Amino acid sequence: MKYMITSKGDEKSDLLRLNMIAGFGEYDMEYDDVEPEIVISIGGDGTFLSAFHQYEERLDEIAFIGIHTGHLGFYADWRPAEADKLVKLLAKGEYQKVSYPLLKTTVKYGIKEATYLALNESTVKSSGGPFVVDVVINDIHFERFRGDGLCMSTPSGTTAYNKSLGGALMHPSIEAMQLTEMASINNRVYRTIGSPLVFPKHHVVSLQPVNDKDFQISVDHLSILHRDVQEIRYEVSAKKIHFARFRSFPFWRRVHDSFIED
Amino acid sequence: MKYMITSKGDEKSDLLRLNMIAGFGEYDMEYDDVEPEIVISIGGDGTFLSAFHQYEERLDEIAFIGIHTGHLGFYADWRPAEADKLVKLLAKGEYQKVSYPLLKTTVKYGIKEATYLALNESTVKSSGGPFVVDVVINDIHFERFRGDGLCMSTPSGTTAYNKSLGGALMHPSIEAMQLTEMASINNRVYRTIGSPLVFPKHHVVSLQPVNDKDFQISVDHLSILHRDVQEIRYEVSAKKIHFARFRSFPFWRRVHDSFIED
Amino acid sequence: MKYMITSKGDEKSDLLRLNMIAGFGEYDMEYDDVEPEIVISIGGDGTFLSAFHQYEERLDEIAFIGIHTGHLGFYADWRPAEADKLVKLLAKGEYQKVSYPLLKTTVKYGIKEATYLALNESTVKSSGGPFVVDVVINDIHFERFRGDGLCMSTPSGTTAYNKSLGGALMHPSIEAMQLTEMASINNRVYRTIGSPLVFPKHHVVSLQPVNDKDFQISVDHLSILHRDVQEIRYEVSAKKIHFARFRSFPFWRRVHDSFIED
Amino acid sequence: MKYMITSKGDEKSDLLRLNMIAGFGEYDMEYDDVEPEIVISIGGDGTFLSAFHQYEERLDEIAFIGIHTGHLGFYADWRPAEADKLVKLLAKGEYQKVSYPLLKTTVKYGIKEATYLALNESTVKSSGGPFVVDVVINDIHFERFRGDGLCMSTPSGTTAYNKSLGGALMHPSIEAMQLTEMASINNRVYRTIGSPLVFPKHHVVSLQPVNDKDFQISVDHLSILHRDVQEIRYEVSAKKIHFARFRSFPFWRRVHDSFIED
Ligand SMILES: NCCN(CC#Cc1nc2c(N)ncnc2n1[C@@H]1O[C@H](CNC(=O)CC(=O)O)[C@@H](O)[C@H]1O)C[C@H]1O[C@@H](n2cnc3c(N)ncnc32)[C@H](O)[C@@H]1O
Ligand SMILES: NCCN(CC#Cc1nc2c(N)ncnc2n1[C@@H]1O[C@H](CNC(=O)CC(=O)O)[C@@H](O)[C@H]1O)C[C@H]1O[C@@H](n2cnc3c(N)ncnc32)[C@H](O)[C@@H]1O
Ligand SMILES: NCCN(CC#Cc1nc2c(N)ncnc2n1[C@@H]1O[C@H](CNC(=O)CC(=O)O)[C@@H](O)[C@H]1O)C[C@H]1O[C@@H](n2cnc3c(N)ncnc32)[C@H](O)[C@@H]1O
Ligand SMILES: NCCN(CC#Cc1nc2c(N)ncnc2n1[C@@H]1O[C@H](CNC(=O)CC(=O)O)[C@@H](O)[C@H]1O)C[C@H]1O[C@@H](n2cnc3c(N)ncnc32)[C@H](O)[C@@H]1O
């Protein structure tokens, strides 16, 4: 059906994209980057994240596929050498779709609301000075966090920033989000839980400013300064990203290949 | 209905048990420690774990209640001062039952099989020398683990040994188990994932010996030497423990009270 | 002799300073904030750090004393209630001086050199995008670090940011510096040592840019954006801070009081 | 002069030892395993540790050399291919000796005293049940430790068990020892420092039993059950191990080669 291809934009990725478009020309496949049904990303995980955010309003109508042209990217299922095989299999169709959970971030202001969707994670840091927030879980005051910041990760994000922060890797069939600390202060007077926390669907984690109300909020690649923040709210999204799957590539093998050996 | 009470066996817990039995005598409540319907544990979390293992063949017919007579125990919902209030509320009934997931460990031998059920965790260490096992996830060889041992935790166990090992705390509505490492060796030749791993229901984690086949396996309080082990298999149990709940005491508040302040 | 007093500037600290000046007026003590011989800091550790940096060119002529007017500050030896006792003991003199090591940071540029002295630590982060540096130890290429940043700590700084990053606490009689990682990336292609590293006097740790040459460098409280950086070099300073000591307050007791109980 | 060679005892190591003995026969070199002046260890780090403990009463008269016949061992300076070159260089002499610090463990009993010397580390675990000790630093009660155990590491041991426990790697010119925790319990009632602690020469760390007095104490490879323990005392030894050095192989390069790439 309708499909489009994003490229990382180096020569290897552009030419692979051109060759796949030529190969798709030999089938009932219309290039359409307004309303695609398949979105192919050629590059790295950064490329795949940008493709996801380019179509985040049509997530339920799109299956994604990643081709990694560098060292294996985690959202990539294919090497460039298999692209012809991919064209042919997509062209037929009848592949299997798998869905991963996503993270909703809501940012509320003084005098207003912005929501963002994350495939990897949403993080919060201060805009300059100390970072201090009260952490409220389903309206229960849980802790006052002092430190560098906090990271809230989807399951497929757990292998990314979350992992570097000591968080657990969780299989993406678990509808959850995971909160990790960045350099928390713990002494006689200041206390945090320390451990990563794993939240199910429908739990709401709210960060509330204590002093400064300005924060740097990142969602996947994109980092914005928000001013006069009243609340940051995290919950598992009702929306999901869908991947087209043509063969078995289990998550735990994907983890093995990315971190142990390949 | 039918009920029994276990005690930690110090004077404070024994007398509380005697007083609750006297108070239950004023209602349609029959003391029965063969086929109870309510099991009250008076003591600490060790006491509550022993009560769970004393009735692990009737889990589906029993609701558990814990009273902590020391500093707050994590499976405890009541202080000794509220025991009269508890007697009265239980006696009426119409409480709410909540269920937590449990962990199944299967140990296979040479020339045989033993299964165990865990409320907190199951751990494996060597019987003396180096601990080396291959870690196999749904029949995929994932890593060769060298170190002190491994811990597989239920959700309610994540606040226990798991937490001390760096694992994530997970809300018990998530049907999962979590594997943490004990002092893994990582150098040029030996490699583990490092991170805790969180597994959904129906995933099977198998540990397979490499050299030595003798291991010390702990399940909650109980540690046994197993000889000539061919495999240790972990999966989320189909069985669940049921608690009688009389009031709201959310898991995250329970975590707050146990680790942040109370 | 000559002395001065800095204040955190709240009402409690200002009035304590005024009262100590009045008490010093009854002795051979001249207030002199150009060339003091004793520098008293009234406030918190931030106050004490600012006092240190105000006199960092006369470190060898100055003994420092800290009074904490909030919850115990780590460079503080006195509570406000003991200030009269302090005035009297200082006025006599014949106290003991103890010295802690300091950290030298050298920043070299394109087309130039800046050096800074740290009592707690010097950290480096990127100016926006990814942080990637080559870590060179005594001219040996040791690792390529990818992550949020790096922290180099003095011994007395090991209880501050360093501690939050997982670093070891080291007794300040050890002339050393300690490098800790902030959220390093470790996968199949990217590898860091992970562990904190402890360097003796005369070892030189050099960070060399890989791509971006702009970095945010913090030295104790003070954070500056440096552009067109060619190298950042760390070594234990030859300079030391001197404290006036009037009674035994061992470092490990100070650690106990600050983190375990007091 | 006088020399001996230990072997790991596989065919490759035995034949290398025989060939080196034959090569030493062509020089003024007498094989003497009672009073050697050079001790060559052919094998792995376990082999080198056993050689050290075989001669621990003549440390001041001996220079050690390690040849690794497997993947690089950390106390090894030579590959088997360079053994002829080693024979020749040793035979002349005029090499440089370098010294690393060692750790003294003293175990005191009821009704008695045993001391041990460690090149890597000394650890303490319980003999079965919970491990609880009071940690006393220079006669100051510092913390009550509850957990799996404690590890006290020399500088050259910091890359071994210590590293797996989160400890810092410290250059062996620093005369220190480092204490790391194994799975400490930290909750509302139980508190440890968490961080590794680095102690200078002449500081004494004493572990004192709280309840159980039976402990499993390991010193390098060797693990013994001690009963009726009154105290375990750690301090940097006055004794040092001496290595014969024929070429530059800096510690930080040795770390790089063992953990980053080689
Ligand atoms: N232009 C890169 C922008 N990043 C794109 C991405 C990604 C990504 N996602 C995953 C994933 N789910 N599971 C495993 N592998 C992953 N990859 C891999 O991470 C690397 C890329 N990233 C960096 O070098 C750091 C950087 O560009 O500051 C490549 O190796 C990918 O292959 C954005 C993402 O970078 C993550 N990130 C930021 N700071 C991090 C830190 N200190 N530690 C670890 N990850 C960090 C964060 O998750 C964000 O979403
Ligand atoms: N006679 C005690 C035998 N233990 C009973 C228990 C328990 C328990 N369960 C939980 C829980 N789910 N969430 C939080 N609090 C918990 N508690 C608390 O842990 C403490 C008890 N335990 C010890 O002191 C250590 C010991 O007796 O070796 C009390 O403070 C309870 O309150 C058995 C359980 O002890 C755990 N354990 C063993 N080694 C551990 C370590 N190094 N770090 C942390 N926990 C460890 C393991 O989970 C096992 O199931
Ligand atoms: N206006 C404060 C600016 N900071 C002054 C200081 C200090 C300080 N030094 C020590 C010390 N050597 N050993 C133990 N206690 C220490 N204190 C204590 O740390 C707290 C103050 N600091 C913050 O809240 C964080 C902040 O103002 O971003 C008080 O509790 C002091 O008492 C500057 C210092 O703040 C440190 N810092 C920065 N980010 C940190 C993090 N994520 N985790 C831990 N420390 C962090 C860094 O060491 C810097 O030098
Ligand atoms: N038959 C082996 C008995 N071990 C000999 C040794 C050693 C050794 N010393 C160092 C060192 N200073 N810096 C770096 N590399 C080192 N190696 C390397 O460690 C590996 C050997 N050891 C094991 O597999 C674990 C085991 O035999 O339980 C080889 O890769 C050597 O090359 C005794 C030593 O094993 C250490 N050890 C024990 N439990 C550990 C754990 N969970 N994590 C890390 N190290 C552990 C402890 O230091 C002890 O002294």
- SS3 for chain A is CEEEEEECCCHHHHHHHHHHHHHHCCCCCEECCCCCCEEEEEECHHHHHHHHHHCCCCHHHCEEEEEECCCCCCCCCECHHHHHHHHHHHHHCCCEEEEEEEEEEEEEECCCEEEEEECCEEEEEECCCCEEEEEEECCEEEEEEEECEEEEECCHHHHCHHHHCCCCEECCCCCEEEEEEECCCCCCCCCCCCCCEEEECCCCEEEEECCCCCEEEEECCEEEEECCEEEEEEEEEEEEEEEEECCCCCHHHHHHHHHCCC
Give the other-Cβ count within 10 Å of C98's Cβ: 16
Query: Alpha-carbon dihedral of residues B69, B71, B75, B80, nearest 10 degrees?
Result: 30
Tell me: is residue D33 an annotated ligand-binding position.
no
- The residue segments making up the domain with residue D46 are 1-101+239-262
Q: Which of residues 175-204 of B touch D (CB under 8 A)?
A: 182-189
C212 in Cβ contact with C116 (< 8 Å) = no
B244 in Cβ contact with B65 (< 8 Å) = yes
C149 lines ligand 3 (CB under 6 A): no
Task: Calculate how far, in angstroms, residue A156's C-alpha sits from the geometric centre of ligand 1.
Answer: 12
Give the other-Cβ count within 10 Å of C187's Cβ: 17
* Two tokens, residue A188: 């006689």
- Residue B111 burial (C-beta neighbours within 10 Å; 0-12, 13-18, 19+): exposed
Distance CA D39, CA D75 (A): 13
Distance CA A182, CA C68 (A): 28
* Two tokens, residue A213: 């109300």
CB distance B197–A260 less than 8 Å?
no
Asked if B255 and B180 sit in the same domain, the reply is no
B155 in Cβ contact with B170 (< 8 Å) = yes
Strand partners for B107: B114, B232
Closest to C161 (Cα-Cα) out of C104, C126, C121, C131: C121
> If DSSP codes are grouped into helix, strand and coil, which group holds residue B23?
helix
Element (H, E) at B208: strand B205-209
Asked if B218 and B260 sit in the same domain, the reply is no
Amino acid, res. A56:
E
Asked if D151 and D258 sit in the same domain, the reply is no
- Residue B249 burial (C-beta neighbours within 10 Å; 0-12, 13-18, 19+): middle
Q: What is the DSSP string of chain C?
A: -EEEEEE--SHHHHHHHHHHHHHHTTSS-EE-SSS-SEEEEEE-HHHHHHHHHHTTTSGGG-EEEEEESSS--TT--B-GGGHHHHHHHHHH---EEEEEEEEEEEEEE---EEEEEESSEEEEEESSS-EEEEEEETTEEEEEEEESEEEEE-TGGGGTHHHHTTPPEE-TTS-EEEEEEES---SSS-----S-EEEETT--EEEEESS---EEEEETTEEEEE-SEEEEEEEEEEEEEEEEESS---HHHHHHHHHT--
Q: What share of chain B is helix, strand, coil (3-state, %, to 5)?
A: 20, 45, 35
**For chain B, what is the domain count?**
2
Terminal CA-CA length for chain A: 34
Q: Whose atoms come closest to the Cα of C100: which ligand?
A: 3
Distance CA A116, CA B2 (A): 53
Q: Whose atoms come closest to the Cα of C122: which ligand?
A: 3
Closest to B45 (Cα-Cα) out of B234, B254, B252: B254
Closest to C212 (Cα-Cα) out of C138, C124, C137, C123: C124
Name residues whose C-beta falls within 8 Å of residue D241's C-beta, 6 or more positions apart in sequence: D52, D59, D64, D99, D100, D102, D119
Element (H, E) at B179: strand B176-182
Compute the half-sphere exposure of residue A183: CA atoms within 13 Å on the CB side of its CA: 23
Strand partners for C169: D197
Give the other-Cβ count within 10 Å of C9's Cβ: 11
Distance CA C72, CA C76 (A): 7
D250 in Cβ contact with C140 (< 8 Å) = yes
Asked if D4 and D78 sit in the same domain, the reply is yes
Asked if C149 and C223 sit in the same domain, the reply is yes
Resolution (Å units): 1.9
> If DSSP codes are grouped into helix, strand and coil, which group holds residue B191?
coil
Nearest Cα of chain C lies from the Cα of D138 at a distance, in angstroms, of: 9
Name residues whose C-beta falls within 8 Å of residue D175's C-beta, 6 or more positions apart in sequence: D101, D200, D201, D236
- Residue A14 burial (C-beta neighbours within 10 Å; 0-12, 13-18, 19+): middle
Asked if B194 and B84 sit in the same domain, the reply is no
Closest to D197 (Cα-Cα) out of D148, D145, D239: D145
Distance CA D3, CA A193 (A): 57
Compute the half-sphere exposure of residue A38: CA atoms within 13 Å on the CB side of its CA: 26
Phi, psi of C62, rounded to the nearest 5 degrees: -130, 135
User: In this complex, which of B200, B252, B260 lies closest to A191 when CB atoms are compared?
Assistant: B260
* Two tokens, residue C115: 């050096």
Asked if D113 and D59 sit in the same domain, the reply is no
Q: Whose atoms come closest to the Cα of C188: which ligand?
A: 1
Amino acid, res. A260:
I
Asked if B200 and B247 sit in the same domain, the reply is no
Q: What is the DSSP string of D188-229?
A: SS-----S-EEEETT--EEEEESS---EEEEETTEEEEE-SE
According to DSSP, residue B157 is labeled G
- Ligand 2 atom 25: the closest Cα is on which residue? D130
Asked if B208 and B141 sit in the same domain, the reply is yes
Strand partners for D97: D244
B234 in Cβ contact with B105 (< 8 Å) = yes
Q: What is the largest CA-CA distance in chain C?
A: 70
Q: What angle do CA B19, B25, B30 make, to 5 degrees?
A: 115
Pocket of ligand 4 (CB under 6 A): B 130, 146-148, 183, 185; D 44-46, 49, 73-74, 120-121, 156-157, 159-161, 164, 220-221
B164 in Cβ contact with B134 (< 8 Å) = no
Find the catalytic residue in A28, A45, A134, A228. A45
Element (H, E) at B31: strand B30-31
B65 in Cβ contact with B86 (< 8 Å) = yes
> If DSSP codes are grouped into helix, strand and coil, which group holds residue B90?
helix
Distance CA C62, CA C242 (A): 7
Q: Active-site residue C28, yes or no?
A: no
Nearest Cα of chain C lies from the Cα of D14 at a distance, in angstroms, of: 34
Asked if A111 and A180 sit in the same domain, the reply is yes
Nearest Cα of chain A lies from the Cα of C41 at a distance, in angstroms, of: 21
Strand partners for A114: A107
Method by which the coordinates were obtained: X-ray
Q: What angle do CA A46, A50, A54 make, to 5 degrees?
A: 170
Distance CA A77, CA A254 (A): 9
Tell me: is residue D10 an annotated ligand-binding position.
no
Distance CA A251, CA C217 (A): 39
Q: Is B257 on the interface with A (CB under 8 A)?
A: no
Q: Kindly list the residues from chain B whose CB atom is less than 8 angstroms away from the CB atom of residue A196.
A: 167-169, 196
Q: Is D234 on the interface with B (CB under 8 A)?
A: no
- Output D79-87 pairs: Cβ under 8 A, ≥24 positions apart: D80/D12, D80/D16, D83/D16, D83/D19, D83/D20, D83/D23, D84/D23, D86/D20, D86/D246, D87/D20, D87/D23, D87/D24, D87/D27
Q: Is C111 on the interface with D (CB under 8 A)?
A: no
Distance CA D33, CA D40 (A): 11
- Residue B22 burial (C-beta neighbours within 10 Å; 0-12, 13-18, 19+): exposed
* Two tokens, residue A70: 């560098």
Strand partners for A129: none
Query: How far does CA B118 lie from the centroid of its chain?
Result: 4
**Conformation bin of residue C156: beta by default, left when phi > 0, alpha when psi is -120 to 50:** alpha
Query: How far does CA C205 lie from the centroid of its chain?
Result: 18
Asked if D106 and D234 sit in the same domain, the reply is yes
Distance CA A221, CA A242 (A): 20
Strand partners for D230: none
Distance CA C4, CA C9 (A): 15
Distance CA A254, CA C213 (A): 34
Q: How many CB pairs under 8 A join A and B?
A: 97
Angle in degrees, 0-180, between the axes of helices C11-24 and C83-92, rounded to the nearest 10: 30
Asked if C64 and C118 sit in the same domain, the reply is no
Amino acid, res. A160:
A
